[PDB]
Paper text:
Here we report cryo-EM structures of the HEAT-repeat protein Met18 from Saccharomyces cerevisiae, a key component of the CIA targeting complex (CTC) that identifies cytosolic and nuclear client proteins and delivers a mature iron-sulfur cluster. Met18 is a 118 kDa alpha solenoid protein comprised entirely of HEAT (Huntingtin, elongation factor 3 (EF3) repeats, protein phosphatase 1A, and the yeast kinase TOR1) repeats. ScMet18 has a curved S-shaped structure comprised of 23 HEAT-repeat (HR) units; each HR contains two α-helices that are connected by loops. We find that in the absence of other CTC proteins, Met18 adopts tetrameric and hexameric states.
To the best of our knowledge, our cryo-EM structure shows for the first time that ScMet18 can form an intertwined hexamer in the absence of other proteins. Our final model contains six copies of Met18 with each protomer consisting of residues 9-1029 with two loops missing at residues 225–241 and 315–337. The hexamer is 154 Å long and has both 3-fold and 2-fold symmetry. For all chains, the N-terminus is solvent-exposed, and the C-terminus is buried. Each chain of the hexamer interacts with 4 other chains (i.e., chain A touches chains B, C, D, and F, but not chain E). The hexamer is comprised of trimers and dimers where chains A, B, and C and chains D, E, and F can form trimers, and chains A and F, B and E, and C and D form dimers. Notably, the dimer from ScMet18 hexamer is not the same as the dimer observed in the crystal structure of MmMet18 in complex with DmCia2b-DmCia1. The curvature of ScMet18 differs from what has been observed previously with the MmMet18 protein in complex with DmCia2-DmCia1; there is a 44 Å shift in the N-terminus of ScMet18 compared to MmMet18. Notably, residues that appeared to be involved in binding Cia2 (R1010, R1013, R1020) are buried in both the hexameric and tetrameric states of ScMet18, indicating that ScCia2 cannot bind to ScMet18 without disrupting these higher order oligomeric states.
Author numbering:
A (entry chain F): 208 to 225, 242 to 314, 338 to 413
B (entry chain E): 414 to 1029
C (entry chain B): 827 to 1029
Write the structure that this text describes.
């Protein structure tokens, strides 16, 4: 019955939030009841200029997506992937962390439901197809597709078959 | 300690005695609820209590009103007397309450007013019963039976009607019994004045004060207990249904009805979970099944209040009659659409939103979809159902809105739908995620950002591939009306694609769109710099023209345009800035000569900044 | 008294037909410094009469006359009279005219920008008044609320930390119905004020 006391424990942890940071990461990803609020805050810290808090927020988001089941990510994937693409285009550093973010997003979406993962993949392909058609930012799109297809055999086969005919 | 009439000697006496009061506090202690019966053994201060009380009263009373400092010191010392333990008897504190009430009523000087307010708050938090008995009851008694009467506080002084209401608003902000009695008395007075008199301003003021009392105390979740809230509701509800059912003078006005509905929602918010089902059944019986009022048979404004009634009940409740009432209200709304007024239509649409977002499942909602008939009222119903669906952040909604975009391609329906697209994101004054309680509704925090992310890409893609300016204008209006309500700091990924459309949005009838776009581009120039440098040649003339007065340029729009001129001056390199110096100074002369005052100061600052940049 | 006090605003007012245009100078006889000189000749008598009155009707009439004179005068042209007018300025924040309120806010803005003591003793009354002004009202315009929030910013900046900590919780508690208003700029300003007041607590 923690839902009755929800939103009371969020404030003190976010007040304590920015060397010994793993405890906060573990606590903030304890239960899925964090998720629907956690992103709402963490995404804001994605706008911070200092790269240290950016890396910390990337690690927190990794711990979040890793242990928030499948429904919360299936709901927040559009906004989270939009933010990750924005920070990719802007650019254990941040780059490898966010590439692993995308990879684990794809893996979780595939593990939860096949139809939702297929919709994710086809939306990503439709939005990133002009990059292949044009000659703009080929490396970033290729790396993003590599992260997406680096989850399992089926996802790899899907991305390969849907990517090679393009180029 | 010698009585005197000189202001300086009295002031020095007060300052000197202000240390002896602290000495007495340190020796014994401070007042407490548990220590209200045990007295101090003995002291020589008690023998001097009469003299110090008498001299303090002379300092406060029978004294020239020009010496505000003496009165402020006197009331501060009286509060310090209230603080110290075991010094003042109940009669003395009652008399002090009387002096404070007389001072706050007769005089309107801000310093003495706030000092008396602080003293009254301290007395209330130490003695709530006495301050309720002497102060609150009198303040409630001053207000008259008829609007705009002659209030006789004393022989000569008369006080305004709004002053007493403001006084009631100020204190009792955290006192349970005081605010409960104030709410009960205000409800009784409103009911009586509406029954015996036909006035609008007085009833509106009373209902606004009641709404303020509920709002200022529901924000702490500790002023009113559950059983106390239930008792207050049992006391207030029949006396509000009496005015609601009768014609009175509040039904004819939409604002008064909306405020009373908000008050009903607030008073139904704090209910123990054991009584939600019975109250829901009683409301269903009273509003639909039985009674003279039939919202599902004859259109009326009253239905809107029912919506505010439903928004307070628990989400996971047994609601057997959900599909039937949904079909009935949909059929009535469709049938009587040409004849119903805007108020009743808005009420029925809010009811539809509440039903869609609270009880009925997504399957029934999508079953009630009909895209074949392109009637305006069907568009209203469809949009207001899909808004409630988006509030739930359902998976199907992200697809349904897409159809709307296709429906925007219509010729005779594109303009109306584009104008109405703003409904998707909009505050309702009844449905937010209140801190603490979380079962009131199903609204999600991140619905706005997700909706904007799913919508903006398709909107910009369609806008960039259109030839006739009608469809382009419709798409731009849709995107802008979505943008004006979404949080500003929540659009970072889409800035690059939205920047040309952001610039295009600066020609719009709605001032809200203009101010939102101005703030968004302020954030852009705060965080990005290349876009501003490349687009300055078009941004500067647009901002310069926006500063001029217009039927759509509000004061906020002009002020934010001047602030954006500040930012673009700061960010853009000097070489480009020198190219746009003479024109800005020439065209800003008719800006600091406008009607408003803050705009004049901002224009003066901008002129000074631009002039100083030239020499440096 | 009441009608004349209300009509007193006519003495200083823009006409848009009699102005000192650059170039031509024979159009009229208006002088540049008439406003400041008139305010100087009027304020002393007005404050002397207001401070020596018992019935609040005549006091209100005097205050209305002074406020209507002040609203049209430039805010940077009143330096000598700040010390005497500060209590009158504070009394002026209860007026039907939003222009009077915005002019008083601008004047006390200049005061707290230049002075630092008067704010120090009068903070205990200024802070609740600004907090109450931010709430929506039939006379509180958007400019009045925005300038009130800005004045909250600068009174937070100027007043020492010890006094500021005494007024932290109340400001945060009472600003909740402020960032939920209809307007957008007011929401941003309230968010910034909440952030500043929160950040001062830890530092």
């Amino acid at each position: 019955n923690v839902e009755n006391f929800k939103e009371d424990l969020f404030d003190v942890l976010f007040c304590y939030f920015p060397d010994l940071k793993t405890a906060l990461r573990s606590a903030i990803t304890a239960t899925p009841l964090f998720a629907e609020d956690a992103y709402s805050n963490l995404l804001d810290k994605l706008t911070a200029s200092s790269p240290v808090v950016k890396n910390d927020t990337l690690l927190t988001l990794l711990e979040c997506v890793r242990k928030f089941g499948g429904s919360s990510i299936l709901e927040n994937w559009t906004l989270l992937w939009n933010a990750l693409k924005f920070e990719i285009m802007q650019n254990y550093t941040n780059y490898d962390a966010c590439l692993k973010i995308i990879n684990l997003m794809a893996l979780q979406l595939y593990n939860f439901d096949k139809v939702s993962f297929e919709k994710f993949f086809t939306h990503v392909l439709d939005e990133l197809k002009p990059n292949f058609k044009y000659e703009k930012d080929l490396k970033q799109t290729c790396q993003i597709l590599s992260a997406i297809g680096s989850g399992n055999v089926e996802i790899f086969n899907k991305v390969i078959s849907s990517t090679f005919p393009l180029f | 300690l010698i009585n005197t009439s000189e202001v300086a000697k009295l002031k020095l006496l007060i300052m000197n005695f202000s240390f002896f009061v602290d000495s007495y506090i340190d020796l014994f202690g401070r007042t407490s609820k548990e220590s209200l019966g045990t007295p101090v053994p003995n002291n020589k201060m008690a023998e001097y209590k009469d003299e110090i009380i008498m001299i303090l009263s002379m300092a406060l009373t029978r004294s020239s009103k020009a010496e505000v400092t003496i009165r402020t010191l006197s009331v501060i010392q009286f509060t310090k007397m209230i603080k110290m333990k075991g010094f003042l008897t109940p009669e003395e504190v009652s008399l002090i309450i009387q002096y404070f009430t007389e001072e706050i009523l007769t005089d309107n000087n801000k310093n003495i007013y706030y000092a008396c307010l602080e003293g009254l708050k301290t007395i209330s938090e130490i003695y709530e019963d006495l301050v309720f008995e002497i102060s609150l009851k009198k303040l409630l008694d001053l207000l008259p039976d008829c609007f705009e009467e002659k209030i006789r506080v004393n022989d000569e002084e008369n006080i305004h009607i709004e002053t007493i209401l403001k006084i009631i608003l100020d204190f009792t902000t955290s006192r349970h019994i005081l605010v409960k009695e104030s709410i009960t008395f205000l409800a009784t007075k409103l009911n009586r004045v509406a029954k015996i008199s036909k006035s609008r301003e007085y009833c509106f003021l009373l209902i606004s004060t009641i709404y303020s009392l509920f709002n200022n105390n529901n924000q702490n979740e500790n002023v009113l207990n559950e059983e106390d809230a239930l008792a207050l509701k049992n006391a207030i509800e029949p006396k509000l249904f009496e005015i609601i059912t009768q014609e009175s003078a509040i039904v004819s006005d939409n604002y008064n009805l909306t405020l009373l509905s908000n008050v009903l929602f607030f008073t139904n918010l704090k209910i123990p979970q054991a009584a939600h089902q019975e109250e829901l059944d009683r409301y269903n019986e009273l509003f639909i099944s039985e009674g003279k009022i039939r919202i599902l048979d004859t259109p009326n404004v009253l239905a809107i209040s029912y919506a505010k009634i439903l928004s307070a009940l628990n989400k996971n409740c047994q609601f057997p009659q959900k599909f039937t009432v949904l079909f009935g209200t949909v059929q009535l709304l469709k049938k009587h659409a040409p004849r119903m007024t805007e108020t009743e239509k808005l009420g029925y649409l809010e009811l539809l939103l509440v039903l869609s977002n609270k009880f009925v499942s997504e399957k029934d909602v999508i079953g009630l979809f009909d895209w074949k008939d392109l009637s305006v009222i069907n568009l209203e119903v469809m949009v207001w159902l899909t808004k409630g669906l988006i509030m739930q952040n359902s998976l199907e909604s992200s697809e349904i809105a897409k159809k709307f975009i296709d429906l925007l391609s219509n010729e005779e329906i594109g303009s109306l739908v584009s104008k109405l697209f703003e409904v998707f994101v909009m505050d309702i004054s009844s449905l937010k995620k209140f801190k603490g309680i979380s079962w009131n509704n199903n609204v999600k925090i991140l619905y706005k950002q997700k909706f904007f992310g799913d919508i903006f890409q398709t909107l910009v893609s369609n806008y960039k591939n259109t030839v006739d300016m009608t469809i382009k204008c419709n798409y731009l209006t849709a995107l802008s009306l979505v943008l004006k309500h979404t949080p500003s700091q929540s659009v970072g990924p889409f800035i690059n694609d939205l920047f040309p459309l952001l610039l295009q949005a600066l020609d719009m009838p709605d001032p809200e769109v203009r101010v939102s776009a101005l703030e968004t581009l302020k954030d852009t120039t705060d965080k990005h710099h290349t876009l501003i440098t490349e687009h300055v040649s078009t941004i500067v003339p647009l901002l310069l023209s926006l500063s001029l007065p217009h039927k759509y340029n509000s004061v906020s729009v002009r002020l934010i345009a001047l602030q954006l001129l500040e930012m673009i001056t700061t960010v853009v390199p000097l070489n480009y800035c020198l190219s746009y110096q003479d024109d800005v100074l020439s065209a800003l002369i008719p800006v600091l000569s406008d009607k408003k005052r803050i705009i004049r100061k901002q224009c003066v600052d901008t002129r000074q900044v631009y002039y100083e940049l030239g020499q440096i």
